């Protein structure tokens, strides 16, 4: 509406940057400055500046000022490429990102060696940060050619904006790279180089960005040990406990699709970062209109599963707050002692995992904890009414999670659960099947292959073989 | 070519051709398939021409994990693919997806690369192999029956090849003392450098800290501007370190030396001439 007045381009981009025929060093140095300042008063105005910024960027792309700029960043007598890059910053949205990714990774990554002037480093770092948000191909060219090294070297710097750009660039690269990208990033020892950024005192945004980067790196379980040896994962929990997302919150559906996997992970630091960021974005999106993107993106069930089985106060806190802000029920944490459950506990657990439709059948058949932990596919198909072949797979996935989380203290006498967990954290689910058949540590060295199948209910052959060959070691 | 594309040139040409013929351009699909949800599954189904079997998938709530483990009986009975060759088309599409997929969330020993080294068509078995808790250190004990019943490898030739290929496998040193909010950045860089150059370190992540001071072979003291004027934590740790007398090295950064603690020498810190002061400090301790 109002922005159409500036959309008519009253400035003509200052006669198209003074007809491009400035020809003088001071001439171009001046000419860049006022078109710069103009783009900032275009950007920084209430509620329509965001929309008119895209119009200015489109106008520049159409006029060719982008390629103008990419030929401007080479002039050796023009020591002041600073204004050139610092103008490239504000005009770089995905539509310009495609064009610059086409041709300018030579000039940008040749400029990346110019690390001495901080006033230009602060801009080229932002250029790399914006570039890393592009596709995996762009990320791989940048990593292979030296953009990652340029970002890494600037961790010794002190400028707040430059450090912010470096941290955000590393987070962007980790999010939008592949297995090879993450492997190379950890190979260059980027986990150790996030320590001076996450352990800061002047500001908090740098700390949050570095922690998000390391948490994203910590969800790739090929390099978990390498990330943990750096000591950077120890800073995530205190920082998240100290900060508050209610007012600090000041993204897109694609961006939150890269936040959900942080929620759906076994790493506490990754889960905490995911919950913090999701709570902040939920606050902002609920305040700025309403949107049901969370239901489609699947963060609702993740938040419910990060509170029902929650064992950390901070995680629970961030979750409960996010669920309340989105206006949904907050499920109660379920008791760990599952073999001592009753019908009420079973009904609640069914309601909290989205199986509310198969609740009347469970109530009618009077399934308690002991019956729940020994439930077979024939029983599920015939008695409780789950005819679908993959609904049963979903139910057994949920039951596997419950069995792994359960607390077998009233049943397990010789602590067989810890023995199974030492072999494999996913072997703990077999504890009830092993102990209800009358087995313990002193009796595992006489069990057979057929017994572990018919009696204990271990279905996978690999698991049976591993358990047998490790039980024979007991002697 | 527009969906699984990895090159822009190719993506741009395919998109231009599709627009010029007047057809909708499918969006590229995320490589991280095990983390998919119902929306991603529905979009992938719509992109490959299986839009008829979309309501069945939505009603059964098939996500990425269920999709990567989908059997012939499940397709025939639960989702409704009665035809015997429609399932062959679907499994062709699923094989292409599995080959393209990105197993970093679940794969720990980089087993996909091992399979791809054998044969680029063996990469589809990664999820099946890792859902059974297998890896590089465990493949030399897997059996023919297991690779069929558990992992899901159907073709006998592939099982034999994988089996025969598997059978051929056969104390802290320095302690750092600083004043908070004044020298924290210097302490961070110092620990990072000393860790990069092979020296173990214990930094205060914020009496057992005193025990760590004892356990540390050496001690590091930063001279932040206006640090000792307050004096304390620095006092207790410095006197504890002096009790043993083990390589007390102060790094001067704007310290004018305003007890018997000051009778020591150190090195001035250079912000930009880095890797030189660190090189000197390596020789110093």
Task: Outline the structure in words.
- The structure is cut from a larger assembly and holds 2 copies of chain A.
- Chain A has 475 residues and is mainly α.
- Chain A is built from 34 helices and no strands.
- Chain A has helices at 4-7, 12-18, 25-43, 49-63, 65-72, 82-90, 94-103, 105-111, 118-132, 136-145, 147-153, 160-176, 179-187, 190-193, 195-198, 205-217, 224-228, 236-242, 245-248, 253-257, 260-263, 268-287, 293-297, 299-308, 313-325, 343-351, 360-365, 369-373, 377-382, 391-405, 416-423, 431-435, 449-454, 461-471.
- In chain A, helix 2 packs antiparallel against helix 3.
- The longest helix of chain A has 20 residues, at 268-287.
- The first copy, chain A, is elongated.
- Chains A and B meet through helix 7, helix 30 and helix 34 of A and helix 5, helix 9 and helix 11 of B.
- It is classed as hydrolase.
- Keywords: DNA binding protein, octamer, hydrolase.
- SARM1 senses DNA to promote NAD degradation.
Compile the SSE list and pairings:
This is part of a larger assembly, with two copies of chain A.
Chain A: H1 4-7, H2 12-18, H3 25-43, H4 49-63, H5 65-72, H6 82-90, H7 94-103, H8 105-111, H9 118-132, H10 136-145, H11 147-153, H12 160-176, H13 179-187, H14 190-193, H15 195-198, H16 205-217, H17 224-228, H18 236-242, H19 245-248, H20 253-257, H21 260-263, H22 268-287, H23 293-297, H24 299-308, H25 313-325, H26 343-351, H27 360-365, H28 369-373, H29 377-382, H30 391-405, H31 416-423, H32 431-435, H33 449-454, H34 461-471
Binding site for NAD(+) 1 (chain A): 43, 50, 89-97, 130-133
Domain SAM (chain A): 341-405, 415-475
Subunit structure (chain A): Homooctamer; forms an octameric ring via SAM domains. Interacts with TICAM1/TRIF and thereby interferes with TICAM1/TRIF function. Interacts with MAPK10/JNK3 and SDC2 (via cytoplasmic domain).
